[PDB]
């Protein structure tokens, strides 16, 4: 999570991604817009002679 500068209209609570995944949210308790970002990942290559 992270603070975001997106504008959500009062009815708007969830911002969806191209893949229908929420890439930004609005907190129900505090009306502030939060950034969403998947955690880091990647393959693990092993270099060996």
């Amino acid at each position: 999570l992270t603070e975001s500068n997106k504008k959500f209209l009062p009815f708007q609570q969830f911002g969806r991604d191209i893949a229908d995944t929420t890439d930004a949210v609005r907190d129900p308790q505090t009306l502030e817009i939060l950034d969403i970002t998947p955690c880091s990942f990647g393959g693990v290559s092993v270099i060996t002679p």
Binding site: K6, Q12, R16
Partner: protein, 34 residues
């Protein structure tokens, strides 16, 4: 009498936010120049 609505009757279709995208939505709309 009659008149033509050029590009009126346009709203946000869903309860979701988008940005810098071209989004297609099949919803209740006012046809252009209607």
């Amino acid at each position: 009498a009659y008149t033509n609505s050029f590009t009126r009757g346009v709203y946000y279709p869903d309860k979701v936010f988008r940005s810098s995208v071209l989004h297609s939505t099949q919803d209740l709309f006012l046809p252009f120049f209607s």
